[PDB]
Each structure stands twice: as structure tokens, then as C-alpha cells.
Design a binder for this molecule. Sequence first.
Ligand code: BGC
Ligand code: BGC
Ligand code: BGC
Lengths: 169, 841, 825
Amino acid sequence: REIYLEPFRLAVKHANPVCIMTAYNKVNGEHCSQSKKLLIDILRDEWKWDGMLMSDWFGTYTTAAAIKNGLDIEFPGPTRWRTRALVSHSLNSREQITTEDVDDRVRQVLKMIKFVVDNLEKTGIVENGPESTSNNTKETSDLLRKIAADSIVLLKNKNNILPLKKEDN
Amino acid sequence: SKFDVEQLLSELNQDEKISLLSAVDFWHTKKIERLGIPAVRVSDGPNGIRGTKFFDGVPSGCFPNGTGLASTFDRDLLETAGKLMAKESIAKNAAVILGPTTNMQRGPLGGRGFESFSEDPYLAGMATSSVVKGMQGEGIAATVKHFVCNDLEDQRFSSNSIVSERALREIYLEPFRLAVKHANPVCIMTAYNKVNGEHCSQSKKLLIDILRDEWKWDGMLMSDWFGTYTTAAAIKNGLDIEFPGPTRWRTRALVSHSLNSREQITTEDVDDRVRQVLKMIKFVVDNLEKTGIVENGPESTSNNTKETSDLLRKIAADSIVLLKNKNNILPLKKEDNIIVIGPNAKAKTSSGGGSASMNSYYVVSPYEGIVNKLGKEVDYTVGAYSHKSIGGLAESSLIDAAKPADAENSGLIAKFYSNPVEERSDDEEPFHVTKVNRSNVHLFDFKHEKVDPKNPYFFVTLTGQYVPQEDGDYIFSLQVYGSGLFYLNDELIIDQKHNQERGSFCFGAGTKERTKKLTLKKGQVYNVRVEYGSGPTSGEFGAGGFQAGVIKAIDDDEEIRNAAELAAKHDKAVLIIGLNGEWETEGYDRENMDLPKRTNELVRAVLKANPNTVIVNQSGTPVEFPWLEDANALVQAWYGGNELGNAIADVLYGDVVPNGKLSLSWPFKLQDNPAFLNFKTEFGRVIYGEDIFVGYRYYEKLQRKVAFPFGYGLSYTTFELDISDFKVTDDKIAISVDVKNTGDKFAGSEVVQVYFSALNSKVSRPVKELKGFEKVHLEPGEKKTVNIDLELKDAISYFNEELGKWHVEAGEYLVSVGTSSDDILSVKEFKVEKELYWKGL
Amino acid sequence: KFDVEQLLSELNQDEKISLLSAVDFWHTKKIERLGIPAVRVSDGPNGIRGTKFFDGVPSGCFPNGTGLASTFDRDLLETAGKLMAKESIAKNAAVILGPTTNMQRGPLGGRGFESFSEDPYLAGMATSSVVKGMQGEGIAATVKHFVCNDLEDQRFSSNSIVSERALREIYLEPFRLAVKHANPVCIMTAYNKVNGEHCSQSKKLLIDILRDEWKWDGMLMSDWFGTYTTAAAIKNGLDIEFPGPTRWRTRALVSHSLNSREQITTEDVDDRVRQVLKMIKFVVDNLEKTGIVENGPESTSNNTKETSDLLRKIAADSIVLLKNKNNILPLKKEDNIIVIGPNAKAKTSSGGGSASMNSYYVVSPYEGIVNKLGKEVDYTVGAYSHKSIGGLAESSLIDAAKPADAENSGLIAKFYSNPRSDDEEPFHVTKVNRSNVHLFKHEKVDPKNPYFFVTLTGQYVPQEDGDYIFSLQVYGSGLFYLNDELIIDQKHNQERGGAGTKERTKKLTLKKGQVYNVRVEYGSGPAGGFQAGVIKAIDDDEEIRNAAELAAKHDKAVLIIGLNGEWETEGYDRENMDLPKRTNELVRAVLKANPNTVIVNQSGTPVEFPWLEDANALVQAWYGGNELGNAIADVLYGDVVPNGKLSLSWPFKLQDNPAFLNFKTEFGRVIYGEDIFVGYRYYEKLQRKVAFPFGYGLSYTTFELDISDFKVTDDKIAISVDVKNTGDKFAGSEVVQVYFSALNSKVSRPVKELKGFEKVHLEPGEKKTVNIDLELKDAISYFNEELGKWHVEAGEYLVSVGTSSDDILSVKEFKVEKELYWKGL
Ligand SMILES: OC[C@H]1O[C@@H](O)[C@H](O)[C@@H](O)[C@@H]1O
Ligand SMILES: OC[C@H]1O[C@@H](O)[C@H](O)[C@@H](O)[C@@H]1O
Ligand SMILES: OC[C@H]1O[C@@H](O)[C@H](O)[C@@H](O)[C@@H]1O
């Protein structure tokens, strides 16, 4: 609660991120990408966060549990755990999941996509669009310089060695 | 033999191990060459060997269906049928047989009631054991299916059989326990259903605690086809091999990812499953010298011999049960001036529908059997129709009308294309071309390099020429799984592309029948043409299938009177009725116990015109006979396989004297049956409310009368018997029974049935329980002693559900001996004083 | 002003713990310091026994539940519960342990007589009426036994295994109706398990359903000793353990669990205490209306004419006329009659066990007939049918040469510390009226190691010459002495026959007029009990013969038969559905000798009448309470026109019934194999014929009905039925019964379901209109097990209106487009 969830709670409360990516590892015996405690009880019922959960890449471990327990989307394609056969066979055989679980998941994907589409006139994104270096400007350059320069930490400076002055050999 | 399980296990790499956990195609395990582990071929089923294909498959020897087989009450004969299934398997180059089936007819309505043996767990177990010993003695592996409580078809992939441990132990598990104890089958197939909330195929309790830790069985478990539902649980929990390939749940990526991620399974689980698949392969390989099986070998009809014909005929004829024979109507004689009537008379109902069915060498219709017998033409009239759907089109069409009705111009032509007719250029060639004999084109397992098994996407143009035999109205029909358009003379008549409605076709997963009735002219030539697309062309689909059919419309009304008029004019009428493999099939259950359509009307009319009528019924499970009181001769013929017609004739004319006994109770009415209210998957479940009171255990407990009881069958002669010796130690029962043919004309076989009863137990039980039987042949006036010896523990235990173990209780017991569960002739009381609690075999 | 939350804030932990169990058999815990009083509870559902069995204060015994339910009269059941409240105030019991509403899934249930109906709508409306009548008087109801205590066999351990659908539709349903319509102040949890878990600690039942879903806010008490754990019962929702002194919730067990973090938290304890406090608040808030006096005395003050007349009406309206050919009924006062049969002079007012009591009086059916006709009435017993011989105290005297006063009739019971020099004294002496002596508190008696001895004495005087059979049953030890001569030994060799012994008997030739000395030396239970009886021996064949002969010499015979509260009792179920002993032979002979014999049958549950076809007039009396005999007279002569309907299916034979195979606890479990198909739900689905169906009963007049108006909204059904007495002689009541059917549902269902009923009184030729309004969801839902929810499904439905489940007289088809899923009330 106090260490690991907190940064996420703060980011959900203040920034409402659109997406969250589930970790590769387990927490207390259960893989995070199929942990109902983490993905539903805490994120949904408790924090009322309404963004979309994507797995880490290949970080999916079951067909039915992950769907039931709140992993919205498996990355990357092409799907391993969620082929049409696997999922619809689970549904028709009553193993683990219901169409409502599948709905629940799809619904969250739809909301992410909603965010993207509603912003397409602001951002100008182009589906399967090309990739430029259009943002390679001096104005970008100065920002990255600023941001970099403010990151630096001075740990020691005895007897005015720093700053250097250009007179110094 | 060289084949070394442990050595090979230590040599296989992880990729290869995973590849061993799933079939490669519909019927073959994974070849591994660098290690000389061959592909093993498996084949359906419990009453004959279909081989590697439904469509265009090699003909074979179809046996009588299970409930017929069990009615023989003949262990030796059932062993012999096993030997014969094995020979038939070898000709198909199948090293493993997907059978026998032994789920329990807890009610009469099951889609596959016909396929299993008996409601009685003892008769079922012994029958299973007998067939399994016959196959494996010959070196072919058996696969007892379906483990366990797959006792209806409704929603079988999800259905949850909710059953107490006592009933689980005493009814359902028990034929498998008997099979394992006496016959040790090489394989078992896990069921599709759940038991008490868990899919059988990933059930630790069924697959490991019981099969392995308790019974110590060491064979290999396979899934039902597609009956696997998780990747890891199924592996952890004991399912050795997934069928069919290509794999779904068990790709290299799913499994190793599960392994690398520490989710559910370890390499030990994987090795445990592989070891078992290696044990089965070693059975096969160890038996190669003896069997002659050739890896991916060809399929022949090489066992189609007179020796086979005779044996199938003996098996069928001994399965027949005589139910009623008043007024010396039977046997028929060459003299009697008979007529043959009824919807099943010229029908060839050799088997039930589904995976148990096959292409037969030939099937002798019951009409043909009679004709063969008398050496003349025999009067006939159809009486009424009783088909579920219209077939018959390929069976009566020619490629070229101008030529004679050959074996080469008969049927239709099927042409397979990668692309559909609306879209292909005329210089596109078929990728496959087959001559078609049967109207049901069943493409489940069709295989070609142009067809992708992960997405079987393809088309068929089916062509021929139809020449009508009478003027009048004809009904054409089309059923599909996928997409279908039916053309007559290039005008579309049935449309099965648009607005498809779910129906009975294809294990209940296909479309309804759509039809078009058209006025037609005799001798005129009509061009028939079916355009078809497989499942994925038209959810997630299988390859599918389709059926084009035609039938000659009739005046149903007029044919019933006609039939009665004709029967009044004959000395005797022989009325052949019943169900068929469309009414009784894998895929779905019957809806009621009724004979179909006008059948009953037909019977009433014939029994009125002529009381000297013999009724011969073909069904796998009970049907109601409403007009039973008036029917003086009634024969239960089951589905008798290739020789069904000759077996019927044999029994009708007394060259074989009836010796079948019913393997199932025959209630008067559907409402009388124990599972009346719980024979449907509802909210995904089925509650076994009758508990251990299945079959005659139910009827006797309620003193409910049935049309005909478990173990009943008449003969042409008569028998009496009496216990001639009796001796119980503290751990065995030996009993001797003398049986005498008291008649003076016919030689006959009689079945001695041994039942047990506890007299003042404090646990509730059935009144009595079959625990022994023997079949004996006797000439007129001949007398033989038959001996019957069993362990106490096997004859008088009940399963104590509170303690989780079997229990021989101290008290008084009663052995009852007789020739049906309702015809006890001889009893004896004994005391048992030292008790016994046991688990295992 | 009794404040629950402020009291919860003020009680210390030990006081909290002490509220979680009862003090003794009948009382909660007084907390002087905060003004929290001890609350007396008392059995049962058909009248109020009070704080003791032995030497109990007499009381008003009502007819038994299945009889009650058979009235189909909410107003009357409501009046009845109002009377039960007065009877309770008279015993100073602030809380009644009733009504009982478990379900007769089969007929043999030992407590089947005690609940209401196999139909959950009838049970739930009966329950709701009785509770509304109790609580309007400010006396609290306790609905029991929650849930699936549907047989007695091994009830403390019996696991009822039942699907969630049958559980919702049949067994939870009368409790749901009661909560929804009557809000009982209390509920008693069952002794058994449901699906593996004792009810008294089942979170699903006690919290998820009763609290989270139904929002019911009353108090749960265990059945008596029906608590099985310390912590789980407290965690899982059992508010108070009865009886005290506590076994499972001592200060040490409870607080040790708290301090050791084992299972429970102080929050769990508070939650239970809060619920006890709320029940206490109901009692204290009604003290001005009720006049309950804490630990107050118990009186017979409600024994009045008002009470007698009401118990008479209730009993008479319970009765169901089952057959009446040839107008044998009603009888004319001038008919020459003989009264025959084992139940004729019996007083079978109730079934056995906790529901039984000591009555002000019980009018036998014979007496009822005597009172009716105002003169002596010919009689012969015909046959005996007792399970055990009693009747000794009921026919004995202290000193024979003194008249049969009330002070002198019975036996003297002298209690002793030791079984002794001349000079030990009795520490208690009681006048004993009834032969079965049931044990009891005394200062010289060690609470739970109770060792004592009883010297039971008096004089017995034979009224006839010949043979007489004496008897003793003990739980413990005792000896029977007649004229200071041992005659029956229940000390030395003992046989179990359910905690105590088998009956031992001695046949003795006695002489009319002569005074014999009865002395029984009893030994205390290691808390006990015993029964010394005596009966005149009869020649059974000759007595059947005699009754036949006599019957032939009269116009009419009235034969009174059936079971009794020893054959139908809490504690065990029946073995079979047979009438006892030679009853059936008695009946055959009488019917042969006089075909115009009226048969009146007393039982809580169905019995087989094998001779039914030859019986021309047949009446189901039930167990009638104090006024049973008068009520029977009223019906036979037509001062009450029979107006009851069967609250139960009456199959021909035991084997026909749906629970035939699973009505026994085997390996500790009972499989509800029939699922939703209970009672008529079963028989209509199988189209199995029964002797008499649910909701059947005749009248002395004829009636007709039709739906005279019908309306459905998306939310509601309103129906108007016109009913008319088409006779010109008797006024009488008819019961309009409203059933629903689903005509095209995806789901399997009963052929039809009772969902409404109204009882209507009509003078000859009179016509009335009854209205019946219901919300769809009440009328046509089924429980969807897969979804875990009730479902109003779209489709076509049929309402059928009739005078029995068979006798359907008017129907209407309607359509439902608005589908609805729901939970809760
Ligand atoms: O590159 C796609 C994803 O790959 C994963 O291995 C990393 O953990 C993620 O941080 C990253 O977004
Ligand atoms: O066809 C192969 C298998 O398929 C399944 O449809 C059936 O349930 C099995 O009995 C059969 O062996
Ligand atoms: O007698 C007090 C209580 O005891 C238990 O024996 C019964 O089950 C209850 O119905 C009764 O209220």
C-alpha cells in the first residue's frame, strides 16, 4: 500500500492515466496480469479508475483467468492466449468465463480507443501513419538541454573548483 | 522389444516432449524420427473401425451397437467380437481403437444410449472387459470411453454431472473399474463434461487420485476430440494427450511460456504426461511383429471375408431379444404366406449416428434378409415413412444418365476448389475429385494439402443426373454446416446460404433441413448440382459437411389403408419399425420415447387387419409401444451391423433360436423413468437425483412395473434351473446351477443371472444387484451344470460415502438366481460375519 | 427509551459476551446496571407451553400447522396469531418460538404436522399472517427453522444437499415472504447443514441472504443446542446461543478467541450483540402494550369463553371434507348413531415434541358428539392404535374411598435425593395428571449432573373385570409395583427404544371395583423422564367383529381413526404411511356392515386409505387443539359448513411420492433429488394420480366462479373473480386459488404455481367479487441458477383460477414483454 501501489494511486487520483500496463511478475503468488485483487478490487472497485489495462509484452499467462480477472488487452499481436478458438471454446464449454467478462474487457478497450479518436483533430494522428523526425527542432533541442541540465546533481564542490571558468587550463 | 520408455524420456528435448502431448492430426500421434518413435494411428470406434475418414472412407465391418452387444450376456462371444474388431483394425492399420463406450443409460433418452452397454454397472463392466481382452489379446489397444458421467448429449461440452460419490462409485465409475481390474486397457478417453464442477479432462480427482493413486492404472489418457479446456490445469491434473491436432491448448509457446513463467505447471508435470504417451507407444511398438501395422499405412477392406460375415451375423442374431411370442406366430416357416411392411423393412439402419458410425462393406436390409432366406421375392409395402430428414440422392443418381447403372457411373461427382464458383475463372482446376455414394457428405476430418487444418476453408461443387422412377411430386432437400445452394437444371431450388437457422444437422450444430417439392416426369433427366462452402467460408468453425436428398412424395393416409388391406390378405405380416441413426445420435438427445410420425397409426391398422403379425423393432434404447396389448409377437433387433437383415431372418425362421436378454429396462411410459425430470443440461448442470437407483434398481425399489424388465428375453424352447451346490467361505462364493432345456423341439441358449441382496442392512440398497451371469447352450432335454465363483467383496459391497470406502457389512444375504431380474427361480440365504473395508481394485 | 447504540457503547466486553447466549432454557441475560431485562421466550407454533413441560401451566392448544394452512384464510390466521399473543402474555413470554415453516418434501417427516404447506406461497402467507397477528399485539415471532430442516432423522448432523434453484424457490421462499410482508423480530436457525455447512454458522444464509440481500434486521437464535463452534458461529451470523448455560460462548472461549486473533474480532461480537439488543428493544418498547413482567408468573388467565370459541372456529375451519356421496353428511341430530374407533375417545390435540403443551382441556371427538346431541351416545372402541400404553395417571386416584375430585385425581410424585432411613423427606411433591412424566429445576438438584429419585403412588380401580396391561418406559431406571409386588423391572436389563428404553409390559387379571396400589420407584436420568401406563386388554378379532355387528344395528356409524403425537413427533420420522395396527381391518369390517359410515381421520400428514374406494364419507380433522371434538361435531352436523382445503398432496401410496428414495439421512446427507418438484409440482409434472390433490376440499353447498375482469401492465396483475353459492340450503365459504403457468419459457417449470388465494363467505344464491392484485415479479419469476438471480422472462403466460390445483374453472392468457432480473424482496 505505502510503497508500491502509492505512486500509481497518486497518478490515478491526480492525472487519470488513460492506460496502465500490468507487470510481468507475481504479487503474493498471482501473476499481476490475472490478479483480480490488483486489476479489479483495487483499480476498479476501490479507486474507480476507468482506463485500460494492457499486459506487458507476452506478459499473459492464461486464457480464461486473465479475461475474468481484468486484463483488458494482450500485447503483442499475434495473440497467443486469446485466439478465437481458445476464447470461444472457453465460453461454450463454461470454463471460467462468461460473455459478460468478455464484454467487460472489450468495454475498456473501447474507452481507450474513444480517447484516441476524440483527440484525432487535436493531435492529427494518422492510422498506420508514417514516422517522421518532424519534431527535431532547436526549440525541442533547448527543452531537452534544459531538462537534462536541471537533472544534474552536484554532490561535492570543495574550494570553488566548480564552476569552471573558460580561463582554466 | 527395444522400445525403452525411460531411456527415450531422458533423450527427448523440451520441444519434442511438448510435441508428444498432442495429436498431430485427427488420428495420429507425433512421429519423432531421430529416436524411432513412430506416429501411432487411432480409430473410431466401439462397433467397428471407421478408419481415417468419414467422407470417401474405406468400407468396413460394422458390428451391432453396444446395447445389442450387451444383450448377448455372452462374455466369450464378446471376447470374440473384440478379436474381430482387432482384425478389422489391422486392415485399417489402426494400432489403437477408440472404444468400447460405457457411459450409463440413467434414463432412456440419451443420444448415445445406443452406443454403451447397459444400465447395469456389472453387465457394462464385464462386457467392456470382454471386448477389451479380445482387442488387446490380438495386440490392438483399446480406449474405454468416456471417463466419466457423459450420460447425455445435451450441452456435453459444458454439462456438469452433479452426482454423489456413492452413485459415482457404484454406477458410473464401476464399469471402468471392472475394465481396469480384468482387462487393463492401454488407453482411456476423458469425457467432455464436468463432474461436480470440474471438466473431467483436467480433474485431478478423476484422472490421478482414482485412476493412478487408487487403481494403479498405468495406461494413457486422451482427451475427447477438442475436450480440452485449459493449457496448464489439464497438464498438471493428468490428461496425457490432447486430440485432435493441430494442437490448441498445447503449442510449444503456450506450454513453455507456462513453464518459464512458473504458472501452474513444472517440467515434472510435462514429463509425467509424456511418460504415459511413451507407454502407449511401447504397447503399439511391442506389438508390431504380431500386428503387421504399418506406420501411416494404407487402409484396406482386406478383412471383408465370409468368416467375418458369419461372425457379424452370429453376433447380431445373438443380440436379438424376443419380447413376446403368443399363438405360435414365430418361428415363421417357408409355407406361411407373408408380407413385409414398415419404414425400417428396406432401411439399412446398421448403427447409431456419430463417431460410432462408418462406411460398411454392405448392409443387409431386414427385407433382404427375408428374401435371402426364402429364395424368392417377398411381398412388401412401405406402410409409412419415419426418416428424420431427406437423404437418398447420391444413392440413386448417375454421373451420366445415358450409361448403365454401373458401380462406376452410379452416385455423384464432388469437386473441391480453393475458391467459390461466383468468383473463379473457368481455367481453375479442382484440387480434388471424388465419386460420391452416400448423400451425407461429412467433412469433419477431410484432409488435403490445399485445406488448412487451423482454418479448413474450401468449396465443393457436387454434380450428377437424376432420373425419376414414377411420375409425381418429388421433395428435394439440403442441410449444411457451412454454406449450400442446390440447383435443379441450373435453377436454384434450395437456398442454405442466407438466413441459416440452427437445427439437427451435423451433431446438432448445423442447419435445419430446407426443402423444395417439385412436380417431375418419369425417365426425364434432371441435372442436380450442389454448390458448397466449408464451415469457415460461410463463430469458429470445423470443416463441417452437407446433405442433398430427394424423396418420392406419397399419400401417407392412403398407404396406411393399403398396408392394412394387404396384411388382411396374407397369412402373416412382418412389420419392421423403429428408430435410426438420425433419431439416435451423438450430438443431441431424444425429446421423448415415441416412435416417429405415422409409425403407430400404421401398427394399429396392421394389427387390426391381421393379429398374426410379428413386429420387429430397431432402436438402441426403449421406445413406447402404445398398442403393446394387441401385438402378439415382438422382436427387439437393435442395430445389428453389416449382417443385420440375415440375423433378423435367422431368428424369425428359427435357424437361430432367440437367446438375447435385455440390457436396459423398458418402461411403459417416459414418465416412469427415474431421470424423467433431470435429463437436460439446465443452468449448465444435471443433477443425478435417483442417486444409485438407476435402471432396474429404480423400478424394483418403487415396485413400478415396466413393459419389459432388465434381463428379460423369450426363447423358442423352455428351461428350468435350480441351485445345485452352494458354498461360502469367509471371502468367496461358489455356486452351482443346473439348467435344463425342458422343451422337446428346439435347442437353445439360456442366461443364468445371479443377483445379491442384503436382508437387514442399515444402509439403504437396491432390492437386488446383478453380480454374476453365465450363458449356456442346451439341446432339447439336455441338462448342464454351470458354475459361478466370486469374491464376497465383489458381490456384496456397497460404497460407504461417509468413510470414502467400500464396505462388506456383516449380516444375512440372499443370492437370487433366475433368467431375468423379474424371473427368479432359486434362492439361498447366507450369513456373513466378518466385515471388510477396502479401496482400489 | 431503550437505546441500542448507546447501550452497545456502554456495555463492557464481558457483558457483551454474556448477551450472546441465553441464561437458561427460556431466558436471555439481565443487565441490571444498564436497564436490560431478561426476556422470556416460549414454544411453540400452535399455542404456548411456557417455562415447563412437567407440571406445566395449562394453555390454549391450537390446531397444528398443516391444519392451520388448510384454512386458506389469512384473516383468520392473523386472528389466530393475535390469540397466540394473548396466550403468551398470560405466560409472560415476550417472544414466541413459532411459526414453523419447513417443507413437507415428502409425507413422513416427523415434524410435518408442525409446518404449514408443501407449497411455498401458502406456507409463506400462512407464516406471514400468524406473525402479523402476533406482532400487532407486540409479542415477537420467531420463524423457524431456517432452513431445510425437512426431516428429523439425525437432524443435528443431517446435510440437506439442494440446488440453488430448489433452495430459492421452495425452502427459502416462505421465509422470504414472511420477512417481506411481516418482518419477524426473530428467526431460529436449523439444526442441520445446507450444502455442507451447519445453518447456525452459514455466512451464505445468515449474512449474505438474510442481511446483505433481504436487509432483514431481526435476531437469529440457534435451535436448542444447535450451535457447533465458538468462533465461526459468531463470525458467520448467529446472534444468540440457546439454551443456557452457554456451551460455546463462555467468557473464556470467546475472549480467548479475541485475544489470540483466532477467527473473530470485536467487531464480530458487537454485530451479534447489536442484533440481540434490537430484539430486546422491541420487547421493552411493547411492555406498556403487553404488560410483560420480567421473570413473571405464568397463569391460565387466557382460559376464557372468548378463547374457547376462537379455538373452536379455527379448528372447525381447518377441517377438510374429502368425500361425501349419498348425502351421508351432514348428520341429522335424530340419526341413530354409533361412534367407533381408536381416536374416538382419544385427545389427539397436537403432534409430539416442542410444539406440544399442557391444555386447559381437550374435547375428544366422542365428547364433541355427546355435547352436540345433548345425550349419551353409543360407542365401541373397535380397535386400539396407541404406540405405547399410557393412561394410568389420567385414570387413577390418591385414595380410592374419597370421591374423584380434582384435588384427589391423579398420582402423587415424591422427589428424593436417595433411593434411605424412614426419615428422609421429599424435597418436592407434585400432583401428577398425565402418565408421561417429562424432565425440571430444583435447588437440591445438581443442574447438569442431575441425580434424583421419584416415588410415584396412588390407587387404581378397574371399571371392568378381566385382563389389564400395565407398562413402564424409562430413560434411566425404575420399577413398577402393584400391591407392593414388583410387576415390571426397568432397572436390571435394558434395551434402547429415542434415548430411553423399550416399553416393558405385564398382563394381569384384575377385578371390577377393587382398589390396587400403584407405586413406581424411579431413578433419575443418569435429565430424564418416564411413563407408567395401564390399558384394558381386549380381544382384537372379537372387538372388530363387535364393532361390525354394532355398526349394522345403527343407521349411521361414525369411525374416528388416524395417528397421534407419538406417531408424529419431533425427534424421528415415520417409517411408513400406514394407519396403525388393525385400524385398516377395523375399517373394512365397519364399511362392510354399514356402507353409510362417516370416517373422520386425525393426522398431521398423509396416510394411506387402502379401503378408500368403499368409504363414502371421509373427513380430515387434523390435530385440532383444545376444541378439536367440538369442531368435529360442528362439521359433521353442519353448524360449520366444511370450508378447509388440503395444504398437502395426498398420494395413494408412499412410493408415489417424490422424496421416496431420499427421505433418510444416509452417510449424513439428504439429496433433494426432486429439485423444484415438490408436492403438486411433482405430481402434475408426472401426471401422477393422487388420492387427493393440493387445495382440494368439498362443501355442503356448490359454488361457481369466473374471472370477471383482468388487467396487466408491464408491472402488475389485477384480477377480479366472481364467486357464487349456487345452492339454496347452506351458506358457506369457498377458496379461490390463483395459479400461474409459463406457456413458452426457455426454462423447465412446474405445470402451475399457486400465487394467490382469497376465501369468500356466501349465503345461498349470493354472489361476490374478490380482487387479487400482484406484481408480475411475485407471480411469474423463477430462480435463474446460472445467473444467481430471479428472472421475469418474456413470453406467454396463463392464469388459472380454481377451487383446487385440479379443479380449474376459468383461465386467462396474457403476454409479458418487459423482462426483469432481480434479487432481494
Ligand atoms: O517494448 C514493449 C514493452 O516491452 C516490455 O518488455 C517492457 O517491460 C515494457 O516496458 C515495454 O513497453
Ligand atoms: O471422432 C473421435 C471422437 O470424437 C468425439 O466426437 C466422440 O465423443 C468420441 O467418442 C470419438 O471417439
Ligand atoms: O423446545 C425448544 C426448541 O427446541 C428444539 O428442540 C426444536 O427444534 C425447536 O423447534 C424448539 O423451539
